[PDB]
Amino acid sequence: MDETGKELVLALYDYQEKSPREVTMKKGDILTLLNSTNKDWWKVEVNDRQGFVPAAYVKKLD
Protein backbone atom coordinates (compact mmCIF):
# COMPACT_ATOMS: atom_id res chain seq x y z
CA MET A 1 0.00 0.00 0.00
CA ASP A 2 1.26 3.48 -0.94
CA GLU A 3 3.80 2.09 -3.41
CA THR A 4 5.14 5.62 -3.94
CA GLY A 5 8.60 4.61 -2.76
CA LYS A 6 9.12 2.63 -5.96
CA GLU A 7 9.25 5.77 -8.09
CA LEU A 8 12.04 8.22 -7.37
CA VAL A 9 13.42 11.20 -9.27
CA LEU A 10 16.94 12.08 -10.34
CA ALA A 11 18.02 15.70 -10.17
CA LEU A 12 19.62 16.21 -13.57
CA TYR A 13 20.41 19.86 -12.88
CA ASP A 14 20.91 21.73 -9.62
CA TYR A 15 18.20 24.10 -8.47
CA GLN A 16 18.15 26.82 -5.85
CA GLU A 17 14.96 27.39 -3.87
CA LYS A 18 13.53 30.71 -5.06
CA SER A 19 10.35 30.51 -2.98
CA PRO A 20 9.42 28.55 0.21
CA ARG A 21 7.09 26.32 -1.84
CA GLU A 22 10.18 25.09 -3.64
CA VAL A 23 13.18 23.10 -2.42
CA THR A 24 16.92 23.18 -3.10
CA MET A 25 18.26 20.07 -4.82
CA LYS A 26 21.79 19.23 -5.92
CA LYS A 27 22.31 17.61 -9.31
CA GLY A 28 22.93 13.90 -9.00
CA ASP A 29 20.63 13.41 -6.01
CA ILE A 30 17.88 10.80 -5.88
CA LEU A 31 14.78 12.38 -4.36
CA THR A 32 11.60 10.79 -3.03
CA LEU A 33 8.34 11.81 -4.70
CA LEU A 34 5.47 13.17 -2.61
CA ASN A 35 3.22 14.34 -5.45
CA SER A 36 3.21 13.95 -9.23
CA THR A 37 -0.16 15.39 -10.24
CA ASN A 38 1.76 18.08 -12.11
CA LYS A 39 3.73 17.99 -15.35
CA ASP A 40 5.72 21.10 -14.45
CA TRP A 41 6.45 20.89 -10.72
CA TRP A 42 6.86 17.75 -8.63
CA LYS A 43 6.77 17.69 -4.85
CA VAL A 44 9.82 16.03 -3.33
CA GLU A 45 11.67 15.73 -0.04
CA VAL A 46 15.33 16.72 0.12
CA ASN A 47 16.96 15.59 3.37
CA ASP A 48 14.57 17.38 5.75
CA ARG A 49 13.13 20.03 3.45
CA GLN A 50 10.06 19.40 1.33
CA GLY A 51 8.94 21.41 -1.68
CA PHE A 52 8.29 21.52 -5.40
CA VAL A 53 10.97 21.10 -8.05
CA PRO A 54 10.83 22.05 -11.76
CA ALA A 55 10.49 18.94 -13.93
CA ALA A 56 12.86 20.64 -16.38
CA TYR A 57 15.76 19.96 -14.00
CA VAL A 58 14.66 16.55 -12.75
CA LYS A 59 13.58 13.26 -14.34
CA LYS A 60 11.64 10.23 -13.10
CA LEU A 61 13.43 6.89 -12.95
CA ASP A 62 11.16 4.10 -14.15
* Among the listed residues 32, 10, 35, 11, the one whose alpha carbon sits nearest the alpha carbon of residue 21: 35
* Among the listed residues 42, 38, 35, 37, the one whose alpha carbon sits nearest the alpha carbon of residue 58: 42
- Where the chain is discontinuous (C–N > 2.5 Å), the residues before each break are none
Q: Is 44:25 a contact under the CB 8 Å cutoff? A: yes
Spatial strand order of the sheet with 30-35 comes to: 49-54, 41-46, 30-35, 8-11, 58-61
